[PDB]
Amino acid sequence: KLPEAYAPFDPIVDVLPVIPVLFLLLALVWQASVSFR
Amino acid sequence: MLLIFQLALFAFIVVSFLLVVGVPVVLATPEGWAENKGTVFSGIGIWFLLVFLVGILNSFVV
Amino acid sequence: LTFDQLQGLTYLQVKGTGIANTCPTLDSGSSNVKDLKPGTYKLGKFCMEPTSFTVKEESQFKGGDAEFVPTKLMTRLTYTLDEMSGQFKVDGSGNVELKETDGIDYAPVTVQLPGGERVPFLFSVKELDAKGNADGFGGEFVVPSYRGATFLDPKGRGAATGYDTAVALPAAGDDEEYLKENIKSAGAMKGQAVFSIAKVDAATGEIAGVFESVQPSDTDLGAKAPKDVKITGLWYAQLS
Amino acid sequence: ESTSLWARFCEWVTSTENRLYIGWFGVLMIPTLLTATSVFIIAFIAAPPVDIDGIREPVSGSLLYGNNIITGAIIPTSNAIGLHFYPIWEAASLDEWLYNGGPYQLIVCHFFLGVCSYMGREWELSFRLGMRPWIAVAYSAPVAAATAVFIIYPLGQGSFSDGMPLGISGTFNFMIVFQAEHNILMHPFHMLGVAGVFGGSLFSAMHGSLVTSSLIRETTENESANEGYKFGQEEETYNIVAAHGYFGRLIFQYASFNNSRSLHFFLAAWPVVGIWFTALGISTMAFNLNGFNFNQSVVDSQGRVINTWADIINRANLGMEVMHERNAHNFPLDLA
Amino acid sequence: LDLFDDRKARQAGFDIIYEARDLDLPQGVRDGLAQARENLDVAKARIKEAEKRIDADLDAYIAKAYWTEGRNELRRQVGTLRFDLNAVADTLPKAAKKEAQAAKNEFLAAVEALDLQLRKKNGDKAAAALADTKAKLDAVIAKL
Amino acid sequence: GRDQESTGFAWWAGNARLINLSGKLLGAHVAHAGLIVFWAGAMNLFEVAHFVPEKPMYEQGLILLPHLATLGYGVGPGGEVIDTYPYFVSGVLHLISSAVLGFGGVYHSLVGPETLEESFPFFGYVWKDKNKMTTILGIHLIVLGLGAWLLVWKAMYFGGIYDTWAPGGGDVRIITNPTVSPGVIFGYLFRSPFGGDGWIVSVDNMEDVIGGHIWIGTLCIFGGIWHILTKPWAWARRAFVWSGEAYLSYSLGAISIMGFTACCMAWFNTTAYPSEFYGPTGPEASQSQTFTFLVRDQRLGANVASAQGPTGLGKYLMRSPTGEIIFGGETMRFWDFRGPWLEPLRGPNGLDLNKLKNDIQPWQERRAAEYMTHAPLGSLNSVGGVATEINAVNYVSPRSWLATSHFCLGFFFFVGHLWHAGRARAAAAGFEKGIDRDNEPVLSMRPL
Amino acid sequence: MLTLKIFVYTVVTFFVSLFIFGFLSNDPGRNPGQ
Amino acid sequence: NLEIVLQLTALLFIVAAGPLVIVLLSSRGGNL
Amino acid sequence: LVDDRLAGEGTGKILGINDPSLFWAITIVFTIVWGVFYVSTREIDAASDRENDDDFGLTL
Ligand SMILES: CCCCCCCCCCCCCCCCCC(=O)OC[C@H](CO[C@@H]1O[C@H](CO[C@H]2O[C@H](CO)[C@H](O)[C@H](O)[C@H]2O)[C@H](O)[C@H](O)[C@H]1O)OC(=O)CCCCCCCCCCCCCCCCC
Ligand code: CLA
Ligand code: CLA
Ligand code: CLA
Ligand SMILES: CC1=C(/C=C/C(C)=C/C=C/C(C)=C/C=C/C=C(C)/C=C/C=C(C)/C=C/C2=C(C)CCCC2(C)C)C(C)(C)CCC1
Ligand SMILES: CC1=C(/C=C/C(C)=C/C=C/C(C)=C/C=C/C=C(C)/C=C/C=C(C)/C=C/C2=C(C)CCCC2(C)C)C(C)(C)CCC1
Ligand SMILES: CC1=C(/C=C/C(C)=C\C=C\C(C)=C\C=C/C=C(C)\C=C\C=C(C)\C=C\C2=C(C)CCCC2(C)C)C(C)(C)CCC1
Ligand code: OEX
Ligand SMILES: [Cl-]
Ligand SMILES: [Cl-]
């Protein structure tokens, strides 16, 4: 587990590792916004 | 110091969220990197200050 | 390699070399077993490394002079019996009685005769009880069945497990043609081994010599007649 | 012009005037594939039985030893060998080499080098002819599948005896045991592989039927329609717009490729991508990352397990598991 | 079937294998770490037996140049020495605990230096390293 | 950015528009670097949070914590995790460092210079400049050498590295005599990849592991200085395609090999990947099963040496085709396996029969029993055991995840070599867009 | 068998050497375009 | 269930932070 | 033992060189091929029509 001082912040850590796969989708939605120019 | 430490960590998380959205927006904005460049450096400076503040406070709380 | 030389080698220095399949050689020592104090010793590190496999073949040239023809080893370096233990009793008059108890005491070996015939056999000295003088002391040993009672043949037929008939033939199964193959037995046989002492080191309690063993081959769980296999080689042991 | 021996040799090797292109990958492909071909033909006809399981129970795989074309096979190397290198010179006699399954390793090792060099030789000719270099990429899909069943799966399992036998019935034994140990049917990658070949078969039939349906009339009815095409034609032999119109009405207008270049990329990508994943599937299952295991997934309120179709598959998998390599296992777990 | 009386099997740990394969039990219980920590007497006993192996078997192995036997003996019945030394040293008072840890590190350095010489097959340096190892071990046990 | 109208690359090949935009290409590579450091930090904290001390590391689906444990952080003797705080600061340090790395990626991509060749000649480059390319190769070669020296400094001066072969049980150990002999180093490099040899996957000492990284650290530094002070020779100039896409394909072919090697390292090696943290290997688990049944059947009373199987071979003990005494059954294939719990029972000739029936320590039995049940077999949905098993145990070995994933990455990055190297030659030759309709090469060749 | 091993080592080295020095012989220049 | 509520809440922000950047640039006529 | 074999399997020998004669087999063959290649480099490059200077080679 995390140290006791960092216990309230545990839920944030539980969703952090999925952020990098969001960048792939973020690039896709960025290209859609500019009409895939 | 536990309450002080967690407030500093929460403040660090909040300012990180502001930079996560604020920095790309001003960078993409043409006038942003010329005018808002001043307030971005303040955000970066505050972010680094909280990094060291949370870092030292970790010693007295863990 | 003597026993001390082998113990001075790491496993990585032996793995793949092939010297793991060699009985230790007894250098120096003596040629007189009389140097051994009479008594009942504890046989240890007994190992028998074959030096030749010959299989007796019936002579088609009449005369009935069935002789042991030379063979070609087929299963690589997996044919030395080692770690065999037991008791060794030395008599003042030179009488010798050796009795094996545990250890490998068996190794499946396959050799190929001229003509491409693979003859498997279970090279074993199981329950070896040899009595005699130092120059030659022989005895009989148990040769168990090459295949265990639960060995399934390619049709699923076995002795203690499997079909008792040819299931592939729903009608012609259980005919007189297939009765022999359907019924399988795992009975054991016996062989004769004659040992001889050539070197004896009283100080270290180590003995060595040669042996000759004659035993039957695999009977294919009673499906074929066993051939006669003559195994000649060296042997080594540590009395203690 | 070239006077040096090497300059003349390198011109001949890379010459595009040879009936069969050699190239530099061909100086590796030709000797390896001929070596594997020679031993394969000789072993398929006259090789002695091979003790595949390491339990001194030889398995006959040769025509001269009682097999037909369907049941004949080159038996994999003995389980006693494992992954150890077993060239003919590491055997005391050629009889011992044959008994332990030597020819399998000789074929597989030279064959793997052959297909890798065949893949490079495909690139090399494209470069010499000035065409785009990705036919070799499409050939990487069957190469990966061949590499997975002959090299990687034996590598992960720990023995060349677990490779695919070089035979028809031997292939079926490979698949059945593979299902029993890994549940390959429930693996998403064989699922993608099946969609790759079912889809590729569908797309081949559709593309072939659509082009054939749109052939521009250039012959009579007493001649083959093929005669309407002359090798080297600068004009198109079928009407792409007409074929698109048919398939557009068949489902709907935008479900059809109006672009021949996009259509042909799709014809190449779909089977190649599918075979890439099923090749990965066997490779992943080489390290025992099996397919989906839904056994006893559905239980009622009181805990009683309600069977599904997955459990019926497990019953079939159970039967193969307890029968493959009958005499080879002394202990209950099939960890090897 | 014919019956056999193996009721003695539970003694000498027939269930050690079954205990280690029980996922319900924590990892400490499966690996035997919890038992040694709970009952320090078994931990102290294994330290004494490990001392016996070092001050006896190793000397013969080095003299006879049985290098593989010496290295294996340093890891068989001794393969729990590091854990056992830590287990006993933890119970010591903090002031004594610090000194026991320093002594333990000295012994561990000597036994690894001895292991190098056995690997190098250097009899002279191994005998010198063995004598140092035996001296360091006595100091550690005295503190524990 | 750009568009297909002015570049000729569609959106799905959009990053190909950065080939000659060195400044934006820099930000692209720095931003992906921030992602790598971000994942390392985020996954580290994720594993630390989801870590329960009642289970071993390999039973919890952790793949990053074992890497920290092998470096000797928060592990006591015997592979027991004593403190996870070192694992925490590793995650935090990476997570924070990714932020500044991410900022530089975003800065150098969106608002920094597009091309560095004008404003910053030191960092500016053109792919055709072989001299400048080698300097960049030389510079980044030195930092790799320095990174290798960090490992040996950790293993020799800073705490040490976890040694699973350490006398007295596996523990963190200071490496004092690294093996830097040329014969040992060259022996691993040019060893066969087949069984028994295993190429470099068979390194079985931490002395050899950090002895090798001393060679790698030194070679990379000398190679860095070499490739900085020299430009490629004529033989190299006429052998390689000097284009940006060509240099990429060279690296793709290289890390494809590295991906495959990591797959085999995680699957076979037990030194750099201790079984205490990564779990048993494939060979280890199969070897542990026969060892477990050998031990339990001895107590029931049976001579394991004399016991026969149905096939006639030894049920418990047999001989390898080289003569060594090995475990019987199907695990005869894994006879070249070596493990910390099994070597004490092995003498020069193989497994020692006397030690197998007299001196089997309880800890050795417990290790083998644990390794057998955690064999590297599992399903896609992480159901432990063979495919013909019920949904009871939720376990897949980290070795299975590491080997399976990095083989798929290794193979796809080999297709990267095939793709990006083929296109590199065609584009340089000048026919990557198609055959010239008026100048078709085949039309000018003699018919076959 | 050593004679066989030396023969194969000679043969394998021969074809590999041709492959290595073949691609070192200005291979990229052997293309039909300009 | 407070844990999963917090996890979904934190997940809500991050899956929105990305699109929030794009829509702000699109609305403000940014160089995106 | 009963038969003779190289017994080099699984021994981790550099390039599989059990005996020094294999070294001469590889070295002699490589040197010969390298020898004929070395005396032909200039001729091969001459076909390029460029001189193998610092700007030689396929370059995009
Ligand atoms: C034209 C364009 C076309 C585009 C097509 C695009 C297609 C996109 C396809 C995506 C397919 C993947 C879908 C992912 C979401 C599915 C839900 C999920 O995943 O959920 C699955 C699980 C669920 O989470 C938890 O997963 C755990 C898995 O066990 C792990 O933890 C256990 C302890 O609980 C044990 O320790 C065990 O050993 C350990 O493995 C347990 O099952 C928990 O009960 C469970 O809650 O994982 C998790 O969500 C967390 C992990 C998820 C990400 C993992 C990525 C890393 C993968 C590495 C291996 C790669 C490849 C291997 C080969 C594969 C061959 C197919
Ligand atoms: C560090 C390695 C690397 C780098 C720097 C590049 C760089 C480049 N590649 Mg390349 N490539 C690589 C590896 C790499 N590639 C590998 C490993 C393969 C084999 C699959 C390819 C196959 C490939 C092709 C076919 C093409 C390129 C192309 C390009 C250029 C533009 C690509 C682009 O705009 O992206 C755009 C990105 C996308 C459109 C999104 C891609 C969607 C993928 C499938 C995401 C799937 C993720 C998922 C987790 C994968 C599942 C399997 C996984 C678990 C292993 C660019 C310079 C293009 C080119 O030739 O340029 C001229 C081109 O067409 N690459
Ligand atoms: C690791 C992934 C990665 C990276 C680092 C890049 C990087 C880059 N891409 Mg690319 N791309 C990718 C993946 C990636 N791409 C994929 C998967 C595809 C297929 C869909 C594409 C397709 C693509 C195209 C078609 C083009 C690029 C282009 C570019 C370049 C400029 C983009 C730009 O200026 O527009 C501006 C983008 C925005 C204004 C929106 C993004 C705003 C920020 C960056 C989002 C991230 C916020 C972040 C969380 C903030 C935290 C940072 C810090 C405060 C902590 C740039 C260097 C362009 C180019 O080639 O330049 C000539 C372009 O034409 N890419
Ligand atoms: C989704 C993409 C992805 C992901 C998530 C991973 C994830 C992982 N990879 Mg992988 N990889 C990938 C793609 C990916 N990879 C691709 C595309 C390839 C090419 C095909 C590879 C090739 C590859 C190889 C060859 C290896 C991995 C390995 C690993 C594992 C360890 C990572 C590591 O430590 O790296 C490296 C870490 C760093 C670069 C940071 C440390 C750098 C410095 C020098 C270290 C200094 C440490 C120092 C001693 C600490 C002491 C403190 C000091 C002050 C003294 C990890 C779980 C390793 C593994 O475990 O094998 C299975 C490994 O060997 N990968
Ligand atoms: C260029 C571009 C791109 C990309 C980009 C990128 C890739 C970026 C990255 C970025 C990044 C890479 C970022 C990062 C960030 C990070 C951060 C910001 C951090 C944070 C942290 C915090 C806030 C804290 C935490 C904590 C600790 C301290 C301890 C524990 C607890 C916790 C967890 C709470 C794209 C695709 C869009 C396209 C277009 C262009
Ligand atoms: C570390 C941390 C942090 C940071 C974070 C971050 C960095 C984030 C980012 C994130 C991101 C980066 C996000 C993004 C995402 C994306 C999305 C969400 C999208 C999606 C999309 C979709 C889903 C769709 C697509 C498409 C189109 C539209 C086109 C066509 C096709 C399709 C439909 C497919 C914070 C602050 C929290 C603090 C704490 C710590
Ligand atoms: C760390 C360590 C170690 C190792 C170390 C080392 C020392 C490594 C190295 C390595 C090296 C040192 C090398 C390798 C590799 C290389 C390669 C693999 C490649 C080659 C390539 C290529 C690519 C070729 C090509 C060619 C040429 C000639 C030119 C052009 C043409 C061609 C393409 C044909 C050991 C084991 C102890 C273990 C522990 C750790
Ligand atoms: O070798 Mn061919 O099949 Ca792969 O699992 Mn274990 O090992 Mn044997 O059994 Mn099931
Ligand atoms: Cl079967
Ligand atoms: Cl088994």
Numbering used by the authors:
A (entry chain K): 10 to 46
B (entry chain Z): 1 to 62
C (entry chain O): 52 to 291
D (entry chain A): 9 to 344
E (entry chain U): 55 to 198
F (entry chain C): 13 to 460
G (entry chain I): 1 to 34
H (entry chain V): 2 to 33
The authors write:
The light reactions of photosynthesis depend on the functions of photosystem II (PSII), cytochrome b6f, and photosystem I (PSI). PSI exhibits a different structural organisation among the photosynthetic organisms, while PSII organises itself mainly into a dimer, regardless of the species of the organism. The green alga Chlorella ohadii, which was isolated from a desert biological soil crust, copes with these harsh conditions, including extremely high daytime illumination (~2000 μE).
We identified OEE3 in the C. ohadii PSII structure (PsbU) as four bundled helices laying atop CP43, contacting PsbO. PsbU extended N-terminus contacted with PsbP, supported by a subsequent helix–helix interaction with CP43. The Psb10 polypeptide N-terminus was located at the stroma, forming a cap over the interface between CP43 and D2, subsequently establishing an interface with PsbE and the PsaF N-termini. Finally, it formed a transmembrane helix parallel to and in strong contact with the PsbE transmembrane helix. PsbY joined a triplet of transmembrane helices that were formed by PsbE, PsbF, and Psb10, while running antiparallel to them. Together, they shield the heme group of cytochrome b559, which otherwise would be exposed to the membrane interior environment and could easily contact with potential deleterious electron acceptors. Additionally, in contrast to most preparations of eukaryotic PSII, where QB is missing, in C. ohadii QB, it was clearly identified at its binding site.
